[PDB]
Amino acid sequence: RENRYANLIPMQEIKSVEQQLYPFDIYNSLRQEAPIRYDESRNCWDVFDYETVKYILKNPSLFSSKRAMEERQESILMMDPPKHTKLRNLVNKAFTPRAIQHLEGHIEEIADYLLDEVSSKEKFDIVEDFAGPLPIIVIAELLGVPIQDRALFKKYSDDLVSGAENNSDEAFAKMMQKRNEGVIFLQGYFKEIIAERQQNKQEDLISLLLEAEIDGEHLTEEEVLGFCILLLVAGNETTTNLITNGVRYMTEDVDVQNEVRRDISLVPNLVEETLRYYPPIQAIGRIAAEDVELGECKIKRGQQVISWAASANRDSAKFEWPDTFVVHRKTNPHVSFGFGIHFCLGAPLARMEGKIAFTKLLEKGGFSKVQNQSLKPIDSPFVFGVKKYEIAFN
Template sequence: MRKESPIRWDSEREAWDVFDYATSKMVLENKDLFSSDRSQKKADSEKTPLERSLIGIDPPKHTSMRALVNRAFTPKVMKHWKPRIARIATMLLDKIDPKSEVDIVEQLSYPLPVIVISEILGVPIEDQEKFKEWSDWVVAGPKDNKPETISALMEQQERVNKELFHYFKEMIALKRETPGEDIISVLLQAEEQGVTLTEDELIGFCILLLIAGNETTTNLISNAFYCFTEFPEAYERIKENPLATLPLTIEEVLRYRSPVQAMGRVVKEDMDLHGHSLKAGDFIVPWIGSANRDEQQFPNSQQFIIDRKPNLHLAFGKGIHFCLGAPLARLEAEVILEEWIKRFPSFKRAASFTLEPIESAFVYGLKEFKV
């Protein structure tokens, strides 16, 4: 597909699919030709806080909002979070019994990002269970008792959205009174310095962090563990010097088993692309997972090469919407993998293991991974 038909129209989904690296990068990067406002057919009042958040808007609004929220993800802020992430990783690893089977997803890669993001947002420990439930619901829909009709599902969704909205509204009021070191307080202080983020925008941003940062990071960590068992020779090399090898290894996991497989854009004006006529308003989907395996960009693209350089993968997107949480996701993966290797250098897949990816066309990860 990448060579013969880098772009094609899917009439069922009514969307253009893009498979090769060069075109995917161009679509993600080109904000003048491709919009991130995927809900542009809705009136502004009908849009959810998430649709109005950073990931769903274009410049000039995106530019000012991004400049503001960048403050919460600077290298200095990340340095501050590192020991706290290490503490959470240690707490999770302490619970592992080295003599029994461990489900990496349930015990490590799932809880770590949720706990980290709730600490970053300043969610009190006693609310973390509820917070985890909401987060799961928003990302993956209901686990049990799935509603039988679409309207019942939408009703439930509406209820969860409202609960989240009110939760953060109250949280913001609390942080205004008693600021802490969390992101909400940092952004409220920025607001006071004359740069504005409305309360709705701040709530939308909190919900976006919850959604954008959890399952993606879970999948990065699970996929890294899976790659370690898939490529034992590479793992032997990583074990010899984890500190030096892990940063590039994590980039290769992001490329080889990309947690986010696709991203959508809306075509802004009629154009010709690879001989196809695209119309303004058409939906277009660069397939990041496919672009990251493009031989034109990555020699030996089907091989897992832990010191691949350069490794200009698109796993975190490209251009103005490049993942805000990339430094945090990389840090979480590095901390937990390094600590795991120190404690349990040798491990193998459980005898009962079968590869079962989570059910999604857009994200890639494992439902469970017993070792």
């Protein structure tokens, strides 16, 4: 309908598969050429510098999160205050570092179990065998939803972050058909689970959402569904890329792999530097709520504003050694989890999963990438990850 969400449409500067697999040199060039620019092919402003990206994310009154192509903004991701505040306050205490600490041993058990399934494999796909399943199992248990067919839910979860091949009408229609398929299955599935919990509450998050009251009324079914699908998709698609991207970097630069294996206290730094350097989410969308001058650029009420975390994370005004993977950084103020009121609810959980995933792989011993694979980027321009990544223990 040409009101298309620009975060789903690839920039024309990113063309080849090699560029999709490492777009950061191009973002860096764009940031230096013009840190804010209007892309005519996507009808949006792209923002590349750290200070302006942070400013946008910190100013929800100026830059709205209500960017659904449909009329209804369905989950807190797409809500502005005050509604955003009331719904997020329902769940914010479930996801703190203290709230999730008890899961550490259980997540270590899942990781050990998954790596046992590949101990006497020659090589294996880190995505299918480890990085994919682990976050799906964790988020399923937190939501309270059975997910025993992980491949099925992965397929449809992936559909919900898919983008268009280009800005053609046909490409957008193909993308919307994929996303529609994921909506049919995942919405249907959670509708059934919600009905089951309505009939018999359990000790799980879905049941809490059915019990909680906002303004003296229960959540609408649409509101509970929004939580379920957002938590499922955000909880697994990104984390899988965090783990895979870290394994990717550690096999592209074995110096880092060896140093962290030999000083495992560096794993939290490795997690943060993977987020900064290979961010699972490259770009965060907003809609200008009013006219806003960002420098000389005049952004008009209602225009799309795409903030490039992948570029901000390498802005040399903010980061020393921005294009170097450094596991000894004293601070790492990346925007890979966003910033401000929508700051990732799952960040403590993602950090724990990443820490455990990397630790278990490192403690199994040295590992290498299988050479002569043709990596396949995930087909969404706001995601950074590969569909498959084969490694082998030495």
